[PDB]
Amino acid sequence: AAAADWKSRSIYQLVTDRFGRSDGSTSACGDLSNYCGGDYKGIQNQLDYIAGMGFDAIWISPIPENTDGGYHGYWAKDFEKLNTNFGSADDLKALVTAAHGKGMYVMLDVVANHAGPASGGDYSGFTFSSASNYHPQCTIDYDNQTSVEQCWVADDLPDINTEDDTIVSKLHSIVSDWVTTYDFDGIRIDTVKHIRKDFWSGYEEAAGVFATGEVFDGDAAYVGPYQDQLSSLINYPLYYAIRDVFSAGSGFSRISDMLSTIKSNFKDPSVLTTFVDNQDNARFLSVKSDMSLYKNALAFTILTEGIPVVYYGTEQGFKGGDDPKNREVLWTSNYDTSSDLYKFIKIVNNDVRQKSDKTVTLDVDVGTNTYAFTHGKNLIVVNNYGSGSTESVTVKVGDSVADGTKLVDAVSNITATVSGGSITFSLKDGLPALFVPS
Ligand SMILES: C[C@H]1O[C@H](O[C@H]2[C@H](O)[C@@H](O)[C@@H](O[C@H]3[C@H](O)[C@@H](O)[C@H](O)O[C@@H]3CO)O[C@@H]2CO)[C@H](O)[C@@H](O)[C@@H]1N[C@H]1C=C(CO)[C@@H](O[C@H]2O[C@H](CO)[C@@H](O[C@H]3O[C@H](C)[C@@H](N[C@H]4C=C(CO)[C@@H](O)[C@H](O)[C@H]4O)[C@H](O)[C@H]3O)[C@H](O)[C@H]2O)[C@H](O)[C@H]1O
Ligand SMILES: *[C@@H]1O[C@H](CO)[C@@H](O)[C@H](O)[C@H]1NC(C)=O
Ligand SMILES: [Ca+2]
């Protein structure tokens, strides 16, 4: 599918080894650094659980055969073989077919930059099977962009020689063939900053579907130019603003300034992927154990401009810290649809979220501790006061809500009516307020 077809989607990001088991065990995994046993049928069995929160797309782990310990998929060995830990080729096709039958997209995570670690330089059984196929090993100096591109991620992931045309062609065929064989609707591209930027347009063209690229960097002037090559980027610049406001009490000018910086630096903010958690960052609740602040952050993330991503296990209140502690197994939760955050995410992401022709007006009211924006016909009011807050809030409603319009908040059923271009209401437990016109 193309960018236009992704604009109104909402993505559930899962780690395949950690989402679901086909044997229905709920038992804990004793080593989060090695395979825990998740598989495709384990995902397929829970598509109703995912869709019930309003998600209409899933992002899955990379699929190829990995080196030892590559439970996350990012350590490819032979790119053209499947990771047998996750299940059969028929199980992957069946998951995609089942998702499509529910109107859902499947986004494949892809790596072009590197292979997994090779024991003593033995590239036996690797797609790129001779040391000459990789750049010489060196440690990245992240202040030297050519180093970022030529040296080895984590100083041990063999860095594929992306300046050799035969290798470039191979990488193109790898991604094209994954997409066409399994009928993926989009890709999430790993390690984008680690290959020369001009490689990426040819790679997305080979894939033939919408791509969102991972440029792990908070500087929009560094990330933004990559959208000349790729349809979308992972919104790392906004991520830091969201965390600063909701987990560290920054004023909302941090978010309004960052939204301006994104508009200045990205040709199309509307397709950037918005997130507040992922597999490379400690989960929000490990940083700030305040459910009201997290709910505000999630309401903002899901409904602001862009294409939202929610990291699996958010909806069960998962709270693990740094990798691997943020790759908890989900099956211990038994997929509880009565969990606090499941019900909350369903309101935001199923009930309020616009699923076609998404429109957002940012910066309807920028306060110090409050922020209002419109999403569709709804007025979204977020805050960073904290749990327990019952502060009176007054916000402007913007140009499309008439005086005398009755608004009802979908989260806490607060009622407020527009008077003189504003609403005033009292917070409930510091919660975000998602005002729907009567
Ligand atoms: C993970 C991430 O790394 C890189 O991101 C950099 C970023 O480029 C830097 O700029 C900076 O970011 C700044 C940012 O720019 C600022 O604006 C902001 O203010 O601050 C941040 C933070 O300083 O740092 C980050 C993080 O270092 C890449 O650019 C990015 O693409 C990466 N994300 C991708 C990539 C991979 C690789 O395919 C995925 O990770 C997978 O692989 C890793 C590595 O194997 C694995 O890591 C776990 O397991 C390892 C065995 C363990 N030890 C290894 C790491 C070493 C040093 O890094 C060695 O010392 C050691 O010998 C190695 O064995 C790791 O510690 C452990 O975390 C992941 O589990 C696996 O998932 C990412 O998931 C993917 O999204
Ligand atoms: C920048 O990185 C490249 C690639 O590793 C390296 O060859 C070059 O010497 C670096 N520049 C400096 C000044 O160190
Ligand atoms: Ca590279």
Residue numbers in the entry: 1 to 438
Task: Paste lines from the article.
Here, we describe the structure and function of three novel α-amylases from Cordyceps farinosa (CfAM), Rhizomucor pusillus (RpAM) and Thamnidium elegans (TeAM) with a higher stability and pH-tolerance with the potential to act as novel biocatalysts for various industrial processes. The sequence of all three enzymes groups them in the GH13 sub-family 1 along with, for example, the amylase from Aspergillus oryzae (also known as TAKA amylase). All three amylases have the classical domain structure with a central (β/α)8-barrel with the active site located on its C-terminal face, together with a small subdomain, inserted between the third strand and helix and a C-terminal β-sandwich. All three amylases have as their hallmark a shortened loop between β2/α3 and two shorter loops in subdomain B located between β3 and α4 of the central (β/α)8-barrel, compared to structures of other fungal amylases, e.g., TAKA-amylase.
The model of TeAM contains one monomer in the asymmetric unit including residues 1 to 438. Whereas TeAM has no significant activity above pH 7, RpAM and CfAM retain significant activity at pH 7 extending up to a pH of 9. RpAM and TeAM both show a pronounced shoulder, suggesting the involvement of more titratable residues in the substrate recognition and catalysis process. Compared to TAKA amylase, all three amylases show a tendency to produce higher amounts of oligomers with a degree of polymerization (dp) of three, with trace amounts of oligomers with a dp of up to seven for TeAM. Although all three amylases were co-crystallized with acarbose, a well-known inhibitor for amylases, a complex with acarbose bound was only obtained for TeAM and CfAM. As expected, the acarbose was found in the substrate binding cleft in each monomer of TeAM and CfAM, with the acarviosine unit sitting in subsites -1 and +1. The catalytic nucleophile D190/D192(CfAM/TeAM) is in a near attack conformation poised to react with the anomeric carbon, whilst the catalytic acid/base E214/E216(CfAM/TeAM) forms a hydrogen bond with the bridging nitrogen of the glycosidic bond with the 4-deoxyglucose in subsite +1. The +3 subsite is formed by the sugar tong, composed of Y142/144 of subdomain B and F216/218 of the central domain, sandwiching the glucose between them. There are three N-glycosylation sites, one at N144 in RpAM and two at N180 and 412 in TeAM. In the case of TeAM, this is due to the deglycosylation procedure with EndoH.
